[PDB]
Structures are given as structure tokens and as C-alpha cells.
């Protein structure tokens, strides 16, 4: 399924309030996002009803403010995108496992209950 693009902070705010398992792809540019978007479209289909995936083009001047609000760091030269996971309306973690269909699907289906302490 299509990965929808968000630019307006109010729209991300609404998404995070209404969906409890959200992956946001923050990209340096539309071109930088291409390969990730191709894969994520298939992941989104596989997790329909369980997870929501969207993207923000931080290269877009009108989206820069949103990327800053969300604490995105795309400053490193070898980093094209950042994948952030939001659980129950708040930032949970940067995605840090393999960027593959099976891995991302399993991540979105895995319970992440409270820390052991």
C-alpha cells in the first residue's frame, strides 16, 4: 500500500494520537527515500490493521520544522534516512535491525512491554 507523506506537524500529531504502532521514515530527500519506500509499501500491506507507516521529506523546506520537532538527525553524510518507531503515541526507538521485509514485519508484530526494572 501507498506510504503517505506528512509535512504539517498537526497531521503527525493526529496520527500519533490515533495510532499506537507507527513507523515514520524521515528522509533527506524524495530520491533518498526511494528504496526504503519501495520496501515499506510491502511491509505496510503485511501489517495492515496492526501498524501504520508514513514518511516525511526533511529536504522539503515546509517539513524541516516537523523534522526538527521530532529530533531527526540526518547530518551524517552516509545517512540518507532515519526510521523512527512510535508506540502508544510516543517515540519508542530508532529502528536498528536489518532493513528487510521479514525483519521490519517481525519488529512491528513484536510486543515491547515494560523494561525489566
Numbering used by the authors: 28 to 144
Question: What do the paper's sentences say?
Answer:
We were able to obtain crystals of the N-terminal non-catalytic domain (residues 29–150) with crystals appearing in 1–2 days. The structure shows a typical thioredoxin-like fold containing a five-stranded central β-sheet in the β1˜ββ3˜ββ2˜ββ4˜ββ5 arrangement; all the strands are parallel except for strand β4. The β-sheet is flanked on both sides by two α-helices that are parallel to each other. The domain does not possess the catalytic CxxC motif but contains three cysteine residues. Two of them, Cys85 and Cys94, form a disulfide bond that connects helix α3 with the preceding loop. The C-terminal tail of the PDIR construct is instrumental in crystal formation wherein the side chains of Leu143 and Trp144 insert into a pocket between strand β1 and helix α1 of an adjacent PDIR domain. The walls of the pocket are formed by the aliphatic parts of Glu31, Asp38, Lys41 and Arg46 while the hydrophobic side chains of Ile30, Ile33, Leu42 and Cys81 occupy the base of the cavity. We suggest that the intermolecular interactions observed in our crystal mimic substrate binding. The surface in PDIR is highly positively charged due to the presence of conserved lysine and arginine residues: Lys37, Lys40, Lys92, Lys95, Lys96 and Arg44. This pronounced charge strongly suggests that the surface does not bind hydrophobic polypeptides; rather, it is adapted for interactions with negatively charged proteins and may participate in PDIR substrate recruitment.
